[PDB]
Amino acid sequence: HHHTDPMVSKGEELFTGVVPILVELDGDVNGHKFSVSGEGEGDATYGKLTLKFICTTGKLPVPWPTLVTTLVLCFSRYPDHMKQHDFFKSAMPEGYVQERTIFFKDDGNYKTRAEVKFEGDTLVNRIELKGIDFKEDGNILGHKLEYNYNSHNLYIMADKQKNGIKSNFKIRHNIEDGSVQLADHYQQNTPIGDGPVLLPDNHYLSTQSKLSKDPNEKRDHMVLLEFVTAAGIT
């Protein structure tokens, strides 16, 4: 890589080539406790993520699709003309906090707090998830969501008061009867270090994701192939 901006050069260099990824989540939804471990790699040059998650406590008590957004936007591909707006890489290696509240329409909500940072050469996403007010018979605790995923656009805005960013966006999960379960996402990110970060102009991330299964895997699990591209600045 080569950019006239040495702050951009610093973040891009950490994400040159393929980077290993570790994901660790501890969850509690309506008192159903569970843990998830994920591994894979990210190639930010192509906005490309490949990850396999395993529920390490047994059966996952919520549908795998509902955890996709919770389970590393530093791997988004930012076009060269937009690399000055890449908050996620500029906070590295010290990292950033990512917090969300996810309102499932006519059901409960997830509250998530995660730290995303480097441990050596590995990009680590360590998460705590708290879910409350779900219907034990609803689409989530009742496992009524199809095992697939749509493409979305997340609008990113600066949160200058907090030296970070915020976004709110809608995820739609297909219900097995042909309907949709809306998951309204509210998100904020703040750096972990004291160093300077890139505060972006308004733009968006364009996502696409494919969920699959490992045919030789007997544990409850999800294979994810995901692409994320920044856009919206001409």
Swiss-Prot record:
Changing residue 37 to R: In mut1.28; shifts fluorescence lifetime from 3.03 to 2.76 ns. In mut2.2; shifts fluorescence lifetime from 3.03 to 1.94 ns. In mut3.3; shifts fluorescence lifetime from 3.03 to 1.88 ns. Keywords: Chromophore, Luminescence, Photoprotein. Green fluorescent protein has been engineered to produce a vast number of variously colored mutants, fusion proteins, and biosensors. Further generation of mutants led to more stable proteins (at 37 degrees Celsius for example) with brighter fluorescence and longer fluorescence lifetimes. Changing residue 202 to I: In mut2.1; shifts fluorescence lifetime from 3.03 to 2.50 ns. It holds the Pfam family GFP. It comes from the Eukaryota. Changing residue 159 to V: In EBFP2.0; shifts the excitation and emission spectra to shorter wavelengths and increases quantum yields compared to BFP. Gene3D superfamilies: Green fluorescent protein (2.40.155.10). Changing residue 107 to E: In mut1.27; shifts fluorescence lifetime from 3.03 to 2.85 ns. Photocytes. Changing residue 180 to A: In mut2.1; shifts fluorescence lifetime from 3.03 to 2.50 ns. One of its GO terms (biological process) is bioluminescence. Changing residue 72 to L: In EYFP; leads to yellow fluorescence, folds faster and more efficiently at 37 degrees Celsius and has superior solubility and brightness. The keyword Acetylation does not apply. Changing residue 109 to T: In EBFP1.2; shifts the excitation and emission spectra to shorter wavelengths and increases quantum yields compared to BFP. Contains a chromophore consisting of modified amino acid residues. Maturation of the chromophore requires nothing other than molecular oxygen. The keyword Transcription regulation does not apply. Changing residue 149 to A: In Cerulean; leads to improved quantum yield, a higher extinction coefficient and is 2.5-fold brighter than ECFP. Changing residue 153 to K: Increases fluorescence at warmer temperatures such as 37 degrees Celsius. In Esmerald; leads to brighter fluorescence. In VisGreen; leads to brighter fluorescence. Energy-transfer acceptor. Its role is to transduce the blue chemiluminescence of the protein aequorin into green fluorescent light by energy transfer. Fluoresces in vivo upon receiving energy from the Ca(2+)-activated photoprotein aequorin. Belongs to the GFP family. Monomer. This is Green fluorescent protein. It comes from Aequorea victoria. The gene is GFP.
